[PDB]
């Protein structure tokens, strides 16, 4: 029973590995929720604390720039870098208040967005020097469009620099050669990275479009790797599930059976978060400056109905419940 499960706030290094090993041996996945604001991270940290669970918070290139502000010029990645750094501090500062472990991660970063990556690593190293931990728990590379040699080669390059701070790296491989991801292809990724550090996960292509989903393939990766490595471990790899929304409870089950520790959500939550605020369209009669349908026809004050603290909270509550659904479906609810 690793320390991680009793901790509170953002975790790093060995705590991230222990948590992922705990997930594999207790058989649950941890949802990874894309966030774009303090409000949406509040929604996720709440759903997580309430169901006594660990959570992964991620920022995409676009979500990171939202934290910066859409009016901040991002031609140079200046917004995604500032925004992600801004969200990192905010999340670090508030996460302990909810009393769970939080993995802080960045989402998909393709080859043309590598400067977004480079800026985060700089800030990471700088932060690591002053404080003993990086800023982010985890970072993702998605060079699945490149050939696999380039993809694995430059992941190793970054990974070597990431490993100096114990940071976690998530890597994606698709079907680019020089259809699903072959287990051989996935083991090649393991070969190079495990030479550097064991703190890495892999997201493969198994029908999870983002003709359908063959979660049984992830077991084939795990099994192939077993043989090659010559190990007893059921789950020699750490695996991630991309494009998760719409898959049945049974699909998520074999995926988790096959070593998946993390399932990404985003646009499900996106919609969820909207519902609560959308459903406040019952009050459009009370959502003008002073005109109220109710009492005092035009002399009533609508402050109590237009306070964003009132209606944004509706979005938080509705997003949280969607997340809670997941936390149960992924068997993560109650694992602390």
Binding residue numbers: 60, 108, 142, 172, 210, 242-245, 264-267
Q: What is the nearest approach in angstroms of a copy of itself to the Cβ of residue 287?
A: 5
How many other CB atoms are found less than 10 A from the CB of residue 247? 19
Nearest to 125 by CA among 115, 134, 117: 134
Binding residues for dihydroxyacetone phosphate: 243-245, 264-267
Instruction: Give the side-chain half-sphere CA count within 13 A for 193.
Output: 27
Site residues (vs a copy of itself, CB under 8 A)? 36-40, 42, 45-46, 50, 62-63, 66-72, 78-79, 82-83, 85-90, 92-94, 96-98, 267, 270-271, 273-274, 277-278, 281, 284, 287, 289, 302-303, 306-309, 311-313, 315-316
Whole-number Å distance between alpha carbons of 97 and 140: 26
Task: Identify the three-state secondary structure at position 311.
Answer: helix
Counting residues that bind Zn ion (by CB under 5 A) gives: 2
In the list Zn ion, a copy of itself, none, the entry touching 229 (Cβ below 5 to 8 angstroms by class) is none
* Helices 114-131 and 148-163, axial angle in degrees (round to 10): 20
Nearest to 266 by CA among 322, 330, 207: 322
Residue 36 vs 199, nearer CB to a copy of itself: 36
In the list a copy of itself, Zn ion, none, the entry touching 242 (Cβ below 5 to 8 angstroms by class) is Zn ion
Give, for 72, the enclosing helix (H) or strand (E). Answer: none
Binding residues for D-glyceraldehyde 3-phosphate: 60
Give the DSSP per-residue string, 101-114: EEEEEE----GGGH
Q: Is 242 in the site for Zn ion (CB under 5 A)?
A: yes
Are 177 and 169 in contact by the 8 Å Cβ rule? The answer is no
Q: What is the nearest approach in angstroms of Zn ion to the Cβ of residue 137?
A: 18
Sketch the per residue contact string, 171 through 210, with Zn ion: x for CB under 5 A, - otherwise.
-x--------------------------------------
Residue 82 vs 165, nearer CB to a copy of itself: 82
């Amino acid at each position: 029973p690793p320390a991680v499960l009793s901790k509170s706030g953002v975790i790093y290094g060995k705590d991230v590995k222990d948590l992922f090993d705990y997930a594999q041996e207790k058989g649950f996945a941890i949802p990874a929720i894309n966030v774009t604001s303090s409000s949406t991270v509040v929604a996720a940290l709440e759903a997580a604390r309430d169901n006594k669970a660990p959570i992964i918070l991620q920022t995409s290139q676009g979500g990171a720039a939202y934290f910066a502000g859409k009016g901040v010029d991002n031609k140079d990645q200046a917004a995604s870098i500032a925004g992600s750094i801004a969200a990192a501090h905010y999340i670090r500062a508030i996460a302990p208040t909810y009393g769970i472990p939080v993995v802080l991660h960045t989402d998909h970063c393709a080859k043309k967005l590598l400067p977004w990556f480079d800026g985060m690593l700089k800030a990471d190293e700088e932060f690591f020097a002053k404080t003993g931990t990086p800023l982010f728990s985890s970072h993702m590379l998605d060079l699945s469009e490149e050939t696999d040699d380039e993809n694995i080669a430059t992941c190793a390059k970054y990974f070597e620099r990431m490993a100096k701070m114990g940071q976690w790296l998530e890597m994606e491989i698709g079907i680019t050669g020089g259809l699903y991801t072959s287990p051989e292809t996935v083991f090649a990724v393991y070969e190079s990275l495990h030479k550097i550090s064991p703190n890495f996960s892999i997201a493969a292509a198994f029908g999870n479009v983002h003709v359908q989903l063959r979660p049984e393939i992830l077991g084939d990766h795990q099994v192939y790797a077993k043989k090659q490595i010559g190990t007893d471990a059921k789950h020699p790899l750490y695996l991630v599930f991309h494009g998760g929304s719409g898959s049945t409870q049974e699909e998520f089950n074999t995926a988790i059976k096959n070593g998946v520790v993390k399932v990404n959500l985003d646009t499900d939550c996106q919609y969820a978060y909207l519902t609560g605020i959308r459903d406040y369209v019952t009050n459009k009669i009370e959502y003008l400056k002073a005109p109220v349908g109710n009492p005092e026809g035009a002399d009533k004050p609508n402050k109590k109905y237009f306070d964003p603290r009132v209606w944004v909270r509706e979005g938080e509550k509705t997003m949280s419940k969607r997340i809670a659904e997941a936390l149960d479906i992924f068997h993560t609810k109650g694992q602390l």
